[PDB]
């Protein structure tokens, strides 16, 4: 009977494959074959933030596109004011193995988690004026790879136990559990409307969930190795994934298929970070060869290089207004490019 | 004016945070974190001395942080990269399915990893008494066919002197690890193998000496002497 179920699943996968093949009629490159190229744009290191001791695993921009938060393996969480290159709120962490950090949309809270299998929520503004652990969430049996604030009262986390969880910060309990990933989830990205979110895991698959009840609407399988980073298109109808097979891919919703892959022959290092520009024309991908490649998302031709680091980048982000891009690195340096 | 006022307030807050941060840097520099890794749960990592476990111990007024992985899945492909900056990886192997082959494969994967290529390994061979009991009693020979051709090295220095067969087996296992260590990498990181009987307190001294040698080699590499 197990063999019968395996045959049933294989037949269903084949049927989905034929449905996708019938859906595809013309590649995205053919559509954007007459589009004027970007023009080989170059961006210099506008600023360098150098307050961390150990490698920087994650950083997240604020809503105002002025304040950012960075987490480093020296157990440090620093909120930089990028305009005046100043720093505020150097938050010490209970566990020094933080691997992710998030900034609340309202700007009132900061999340961080790591090898402790726990997500700590810190209240930025207090009557005492000192940042303290507002709440500790521990419903994960594996390391927290990513976390994102939903509405300043709910948080979505992905862990190394192959599960995602939507929490309630007030009650400190798991509200919803998203399951279906084989490999541990490495990254997640919220939709602009906060109605859906995509998650990329250690398997080649990426799954799209809806936070209201979380039943894994769609699954995309185009990569060949672990999906390290995921980012969501500004219009909300597409997303981009970066994997360890040294390729980036652009999937789209409501078509359940690949659109275009970004890769080069002389690239043999995996992707660690992926982000989109304000209009979505540019796709910024961080690499393991200490460089950041800026791709024309419509033509899959390299448009820029951002080689300002000494070690792997491991994190990058673009401001809400698209003014500047911040890249962290394992050399304990943050760089703001514009 | 508001703008100079808030700029001054932000600058003084930055100065205070800078003071606290240099104070924290002083503590962080003199710590020498280590990663205590074991092939399986059978290995007696605990007596060597959720999510992650911390152990603080001082040797000759030198602080040491040992991190033991707890509530994590068996797939260590991703989170092991968090330990590329540790001073050493204390790899504990029970020298008593073929668990030895699994330990060898794990050691090879750790040694040949791209991000751990600069991290040194302190190899501990536990279950020495168990290995002696198994060797004297009438599974090592069949698991490793090359053991028959193996001969005890000249610098065996068998201090316990329990048998000329136990020493041969333990040195065969040590050479099995050293083959990978020497072949895969040269001039970047070093492997320090030791025999432990799990009833001795000298393990922390051996770890201290190996860490001293590791940092000496790292400093020597700055001048390209090594």
């Amino acid at each position, epitope marked *: 009977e197990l063999d019968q179920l395996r045959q049933e699943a294989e037949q269903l996968k084949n049927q989905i494959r034929d449905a996708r093949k019938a859906c595809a009629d013309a590649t995205l490159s053919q559509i954007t074959n007459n589009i004027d190229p970007v023009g080989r744009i170059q961006m210099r290191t506008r600023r360098t933030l150098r307050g961390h001791l150990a490698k920087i695993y994650a950083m997240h921009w604020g809503t105002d596109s002025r304040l950012l938060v960075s987490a480093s393996q020296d157990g440090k969480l620093i909120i930089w004011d990028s305009y005046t290159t100043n720093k505020v709120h150097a938050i010490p962490l209970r566990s020094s193995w933080v691997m992710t950090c998030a900034y609340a949309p309202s700007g009132n809270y900061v999340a961080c988690g790591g090898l402790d299998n726990i997500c700590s929520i810190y209240n930025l503004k207090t009557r005492e004026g000192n940042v303290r652990v507002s709440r500790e969430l521990a419903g994960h049996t594996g390391y927290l790879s990513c976390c994102r604030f939903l509405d300043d009262n709910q948080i979505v986390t992905s862990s190394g136990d192959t599960t995602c969880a939507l929490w309630d910060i007030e009650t400190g309990q798991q509200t919803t559990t998203f399951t279906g990933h084989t490999g541990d989830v490495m990254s997640l990205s919220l939709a602009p409307d906060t109605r859906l979110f995509v998650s990329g895991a*250690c398997d080649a698959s990426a799954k799209l969930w809806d936070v209201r009840e979380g039943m894994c609407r769609q699954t995309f*399988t185009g990569h060949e190795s672990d999906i390290n980073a995921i980012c969501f298109f500004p219009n909300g109808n597409a997303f981009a994934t970066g994997s360890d097979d040294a390729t980036c891919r652009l999937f789209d919703l409501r078509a359940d298929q690949e659109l275009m892959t970004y890769s080069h022959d002389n690239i043999i290092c995996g992707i660690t970070s992926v982000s989109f520009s304000k209009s979505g024309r540019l796709l910024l991908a961080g690499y393991d060869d200490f460089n950041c490649n800026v791709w024309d998302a419509l033509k899959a031709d390299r448009a820029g290089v951002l080689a300002g680091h000494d070690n792997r980048v491991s994190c990058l982000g673009v401001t809400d207004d698209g003014m500047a891009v911040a890249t962290g690195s394992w050399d304990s340096f943050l760089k703001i490019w514009n | 004016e508001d703008q100079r006022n808030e700029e001054k307030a932000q600058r003084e807050a930055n100065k205070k945070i800078e003071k606290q941060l240099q104070k924290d840097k002083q503590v962080y520099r003199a710590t020498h974190r280590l990663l205590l890794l074991g092939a399986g749960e059978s290995g007696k990592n605990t007596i060597v001395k959720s999510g992650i476990f911390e152990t603080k111990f001082q040797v000759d007024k030198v602080n040491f942080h040992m991190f033991d992985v707890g509530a994590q899945r068996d*797939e260590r*492909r991703k989170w*092991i990269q968090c330990f590329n900056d540790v001073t050493a990886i204390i790899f504990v192997v029970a020298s008593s399915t*073929n668990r030895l082959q699994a330990a060898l494969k794990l050691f090879d994967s*750790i040694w040949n*990893n791209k991000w751990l290529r600069d991290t040194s390994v302190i190899l501990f061979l536990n279950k020495q008494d168990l290995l002696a009991e198994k060797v004297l009693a009438g599974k090592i020979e*069949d698991y490793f066919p090359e053991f028959a051709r193996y001969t005890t090295p000249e610098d065996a220095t068998p201090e316990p002197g329990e048998d000329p067969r136990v020493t041969r087996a333990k040195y065969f296992i040590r050479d099995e690890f050293l083959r990978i260590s020497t072949a895969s990498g040269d001039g970047r990181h070093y492997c320090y193998p030791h025999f432990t009987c799990a009833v001795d307190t000298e393990n922390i001294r051996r770890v201290f000496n190996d860490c001293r040698d590791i940092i000496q080699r790292m400093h020597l590499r700055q001048y390209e002497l090594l």
Partner: nanobody
């Protein structure tokens, strides 16, 4: 998607010969190092052998060193394991595993349970 399908191997008399063929799809075969692992009844996954890209770095576990041989055809996108002298204690489910990262001399967690880039496996039983 990454799909590894193993074929061959049934009931074989002790001392007999067998051939296991692993067909791979969804990735560039030549970029990855391949592995053969096995799981005995009630024993857990154990590593049997591995071969690097384009061969030339073959290695086996000690138990099967003199008997089993592993080869690969990059053009045919296939992995082969020949078992020329079977013994009763190697009755197991055999899996074709593809290591997680391309262009890597190291590769992790093939023997770990719930591993993504592993096939369904074939039963190989040796008995009278």
């Amino acid at each position: 998607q990454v799909q590894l399908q193993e074929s061959g191997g049934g009931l074989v008399q002790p001392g007999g010969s067998l051939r296991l063929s692993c067909a791979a799809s969804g990735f560039t075969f030549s970029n990855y190092k391949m592995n053969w692992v096995r799981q005995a009844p009630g024993k857990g996954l154990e590593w049997v052998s591995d071969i690097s890209q384009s061969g030339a770095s073959i290695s086996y576990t000690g138990s099967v060193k003199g008997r089993f041989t592993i080869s690969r055809d990059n053009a045919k996108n296939t992995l082969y394991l020949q078992m020329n002298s079977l013994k009763p204690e190697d009755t197991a489910v055999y899996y074709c595993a593809r290591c997680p990262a391309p262009f890597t001399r190291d590769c992790f967690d093939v023997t770990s349970t719930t591993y993504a880039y592993r096939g369904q496996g074939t039963q190989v039983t040796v008995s009278s």
